[PDB]
């Protein structure tokens, strides 16, 4: 089984994919149309679904069209010791394909994390965010498995180019983490970090946040940490901080040119998902208020107007 499989879905998904082209065969893209297919995508895997050809937008409309086709997509995905799934919560295709695929990985009893974007353009985007987050929490519950995600809100003002750019970087860091070439760091360890419910049975499988941090201080400030996993380049600087239920260390190799940071900390928690939802729901609400506070003029035809079948008023 390959070391890591990288799944992207939808527009955002493939846009983030173009920056990870150098990983070639490890990258698998999926969309409902080719709207976002560029040239650097031939260096990687690409699959589009039938019947759909890129419309919504609408997840309710896309789901039943793509559901039957999932078995087939799964076949285009080899066994892996870890997976990364990436897509937007805001659109219609990524926010369907992604969770559908996520559900299959969970039946592979696989070890995986997800990178998702909070789209913030419209009450469509916002509404979709909520539904997809809700979807992910239902899968967690039904499959009894934490659904671990790095959440990136499209902060007002900031360019998608920029937002995509940091997601790419965070993905590399996870690719490093699971590149199996560390000291003390087992493949079984990594599974136990991200699938903490398998051994910690008193804990509740739910949607969790993944925090990636390059300082000990930054990691400690992650609230109500559940499951930590640290990489050190200088083993001496190793410190056990915070209060996670699960903690595991590995050591990095200096001759590894992947290593671009003195120390990386991968911290899963869940308490912060509440606020994410509060923000998103409050945004939708404030927009929705102005939407239904808008008023239009009365018509400029009335019942004295002779109107034919084509709408002609002569
Ligand atoms: N960060 C980021 N956000 C994007 C990008 N493209 C689109 N968006 C935002 O994400 C939402 C969904 O877009 P898209 O990924 O094309 O949806 P999908 O293909 O139907 O799954 C849009 O409404 C925008 O809010 C991107 O490349 N990066
Ligand atoms: Mg699209």
UniProtKB/Swiss-Prot annotation:
Alphabetical UniProt keywords: GTP-binding, Host cytoplasm, Hydrolase, Nucleotide-binding
Result when mutating residue 302 to A: 60% loss of ability to form filaments
Catalytic reactions of this protein: GTP + H2O = GDP + phosphate + H(+)
Record note on what altering residue 216 to A/D does: Complete loss of ability to form filaments
Pfam families (UniProt xref): TubZ_C_2
Main EC class the enzyme belongs to: hydrolase
GO MF term list: GTP binding; GTPase activity; identical protein binding
Residues holding GTP: 11-12, 92-94, 164
EC numbers, comma separated: 3.6.5.-
CC terms in the record's Gene Ontology section: host cell cytoplasm
Description of activity control: The non-hydrolyzable GTP analog GMPCPP stabilizes filaments, which never disassemble.
Outcome reported for the amino acid change (mutating residue 304 to R): Complete loss of ability to form filaments
Subunit structure: Homomultimer. Polymerizes in a strictly GTP-dependent manner.
Role according to the record: A tubulin-like GTPase that forms filaments, which are required for positioning viral DNA and capsids in the middle of the host cell for optimal replication. The motor component of a partition system which pushes phage DNA (encased by protein gp105) to the center of the bacterial host cell. Also required for movement of phage capsids to the vicinity of the viral DNA and rotation of the encased viral DNA at midcell. Forms filaments during the lytic phase, which position phage DNA at the center of the bacterial host cell.
The protein's name in its UniProt record: Phage tubulin-like protein
